Every structure is written in C-alpha cells, then in structure tokens.
Amino acid sequence: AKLGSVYTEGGFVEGVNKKLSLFGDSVDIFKGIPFAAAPKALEKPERHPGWQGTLKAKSFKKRCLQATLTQDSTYGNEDCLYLNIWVPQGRKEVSHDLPVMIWIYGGAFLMGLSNYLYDGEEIATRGNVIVVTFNYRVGPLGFLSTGDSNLPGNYGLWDQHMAIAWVKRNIEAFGGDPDQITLFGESAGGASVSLQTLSPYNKGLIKRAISQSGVGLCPWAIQQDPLFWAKRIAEKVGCPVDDTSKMAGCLKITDPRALTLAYKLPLGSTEYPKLHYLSFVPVIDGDFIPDDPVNLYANAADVDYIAGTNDMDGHLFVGMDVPAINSNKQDVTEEDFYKLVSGLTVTKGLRGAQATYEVYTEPWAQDSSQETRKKTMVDLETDILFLIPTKIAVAQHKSHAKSANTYTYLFSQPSRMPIYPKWMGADHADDLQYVFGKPFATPLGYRAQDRTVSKAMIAYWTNFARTGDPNTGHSTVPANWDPYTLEDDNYLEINKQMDSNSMKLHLRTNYLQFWTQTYQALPTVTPVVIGF
C-alpha cells in the first residue's frame, strides 16, 4: 500500500514511495511541504495560502539562513518554512493511527549531504512511526529580541509551534494519530522541545517529548538580556540603536544575509566561553514563554518525557575555549583551568570561581596528569551546559508529572573521531548518527557495535513514541530502562554494552549538590549545528 496525493489544509501534496521489501512494505516520503507562508523577517509565521492542484513534495527545500564556523557566507534561504514526512507502509492498507515523531533540530552555526539529520526514513521504518522533520528560523532572524513589544523575539519557536500545530491538524491524512505526537530533538532542538512542552501555546498538542542534550532550563537556552545583543548586531549592520521601535524596524529591513553573517561566534581567544556569544536564543517574552521555564512545568505535567545527555557533551564547546584539550602536544595548566571556570562563573565572581575551581580540582589528587586536567575541563562544561540543567529538568518533570512518565539516560558510546584524544567519550551530538540509524542507512562507514547502539536507540525512541515507555512498543529492547524516580536518580547508560548493569544510579550527585546548593547559595556579584 502507498498514499497517493494527500489532502492538507492548504491543498494536495504528493511525494514518492520507496519499496522496502518483497513483502510489499514501503515508505511514503514527502519533502518540501510548506507549513507556513514564507516568513517576513522578524515577524511571527502565518498560514500558507491555499493552492490548487498537487504540490510536488519530492525534494528537500533550502533550510533557513545560517553559517559555518568560518562565517564567511550564509547557507539556506529566508523562504524555508517547509517540513518533510516519512510514513512507513505495509501491504494491505495504508498506515493509520501511527505515532508521530516531530524532530526539532537546527542551529545558527554548522561544523563539518546537508540534510543528513533531516531524513527520518530509518527511524520511521525500523520503529513503525511517522517522522516529521522541518526547518525553523535560527540565529538573529530566528531569535532577535528587544525584550519588549518592538521585537518580542522567539520566532524560531513560533515556527516550531507552527509546524507542530500543522502536524496536529494534518497528520491524520498521512496515517498519523494527532493525539500521539512526540517531539524529539537535540541541542537547541532539545531545549526547543523542552520549551515547546512548557509553552501554554502547545496545550493539547503534545503527547510526549524527548530532549537530547538540551532542556529549557539550560543556561544557554534563555537570553536574560536580549536588548543588549539586539543593539549590538543592529549597530553592526548600520541600524539606529537609539530607540527600540526604530531599531526593530531597521532590523526587519536590513539584508537578512548580512544580518545573519553579523552573528559572530568568536573562535579567537575571548574572556568568556563561546556559549556566552550564542546570544540569539529564546527569551521570556511573557507570551510564548510567559515566565521562566522552571516555573512552567505544570504545562508539561501530562507529557511523557525523556531527557538525557552525552558522556562528554561539553567537549565540543570547551575544546573551542581550550583547544589544547584535543592536542596531545600542548599542555593545560591549573591557571588555564582557573581562567575557564572564572569565565563560566562570572555571576558569582571570585568566590564562585574559587568554590568551583576547588570542587573540580579535588579529584586531581594534587598530582593530576594532562589527560586528567583536560578531562576535568570537559566535565565542567558538560555539567554546567547540559548535565545539571537536565538533572533538574528531569527532576522537575517527575515531581510535577501527573499521568506522565519520566526517563533519563546518559549516552556514552565513545567517539570514533581520530582528531580527538583516545580517552574521548561521547561528544555533543554524537548520539545523532545512532538515533537516525546511520549505521544502517550508510553501513560501510560503521562497525557492528554502532549498529547495536543505533538499533537500541531507535528501538527505545520509537517505543517511547508509541507507548510513553521506551521498553514497550514495536521493538524489543536490549536492556530494561526503568523510569526515573527522585529518590533513586536512575538513568540508563546507552552504549555498545547494553546489559543488566545498564541502569545506573546517582550520576554526579556531588556535582549537582555543589551547583544547586553550594554555588546557588553564594551571593551574586555581576555535520553538527550549535546555537539557536
């Protein structure tokens, strides 16, 4: 069986059908379906006008404007609000009531086909679920804000919400169950997933959610001072910074490609960690995000939730702050480490920096090797940027959850990157190739253990999407994943060895204690994509 032309709110769409076996199995692939009219710079998205005939949804549309780490040219196009769908099909009849997984992924900066992480075929077919990938506005075009009416901000979030509302209204025609939507995404997408479940705008739309290395409680997920950054990029492009209204009007009119290129990620030595410069992110606009995310968990009370991080999630970032971490030739001193912590602890000044340098150097047993120091730098950023906020998000979700499940994991499959050190664990986004089944899609570049991890991850993910329990659904699982409880703080460690010892307890509880107890008590003084 195969869908023909599917009716959507704006008209008919037609994709392609890829035969998967002699059994008559296949997968219906739709690419380039608009979920909104091409967006006006810095304005909320609107419904796409109706069209006659059949929209040929046979190829990926350009994604929104973004740039690479070199930041010399832009990629994408402003006209980018399109989505893609994969519908696994059986023999007798087209699929119906299938779980719907919406992948939220996108960033202002890419480091490395470009639609590698936008193809949901492996996931949809191995897990028997519908996968929807789409594009949303990123960087300044997606998140510029003046902190007021002149430019409320959160455009990329509105775009995501638009895609979600569209899937809710139209996925049934594709064979999906509108009441079984699972949002999943990593990094900014992960924080986005979190933010979407917390926004009152998504009431009744989301069933479950998966945050991979990113939650709305992450420090880098909410910009506390958007006006400061709005003014900076504005002045950089020749706009009036005198009054917000005129500045906003100018930003809406300036060249989108120049505006995009004006968003710089300083790779040269800086006083603050790189993450400080990834300023164009969501803001508490009192609308889409009506309050600080931590106070919005009642909105996700009935949303099943899986949130997790990677072994060395912070490696990618700290390696930009301290490049010597990756070099076996160059060394790192206690000074370099103190400088790193001070930059990360500005809010609590010298005391905060001292308390932090102390705790993280305690395990050095005053005779630390280079590998030890570099590993500690990675742990520091992994903790602050991902582990800790995820731990409290998971905890907050469990505590407020009503009829919703809460699970947490630690992805620790060691990096295969030759450039990085031998002791390297799972870096930021390393989980993606497994979640997206690349060891199967593109086998020749992978080993048996990679297929094992991928199989396990897609299984857990798609099972969760179907039942709200990673253990049950369309796939068998290599290990029992127990739901997270506050008392036990249990998590599944995902890697090539999934066995009886896979469920672990209390991950870095001492560090969680430091940050939430010690640190917070101190007085306040002052092909991967990153950023929102």
Swiss-Prot record:
Keyword entries, A-Z: Disulfide bond, Glycoprotein, Hydrolase, Lipid degradation, Lipid metabolism, Secreted, Serine esterase, Signal
Enzyme class: hydrolase
Organism of this sequence: Bos taurus (Bovine)
InterPro entries, alphabetized: AB_hydrolase_fold (IPR029058), CarbesteraseB (IPR002018), Carboxylesterase_B_AS (IPR019826), Carboxylesterase_B_CS (IPR019819), Neuroligin/BSAL (IPR051093)
Gene Ontology CC: cytoplasm; extracellular region; membrane
Alphabetical GO biological process terms: ceramide catabolic process; pancreatic juice secretion
Protein name in UniProt: Bile salt-activated lipase
Record-annotated active site: S187, D313, H428
Superkingdom of origin organism: Eukaryota
Main location: secreted
Reactions this protein catalyses: a triacylglycerol + H2O = a diacylglycerol + a fatty acid + H(+); 1,2,3-tri-(9Z-octadecenoyl)-glycerol + H2O = di-(9Z)-octadecenoylglycerol + (9Z)-octadecenoate + H(+); 1,2,3-trioctanoylglycerol + H2O = dioctanoylglycerol + octanoate + H(+); a sterol ester + H2O = a sterol + a fatty acid + H(+)
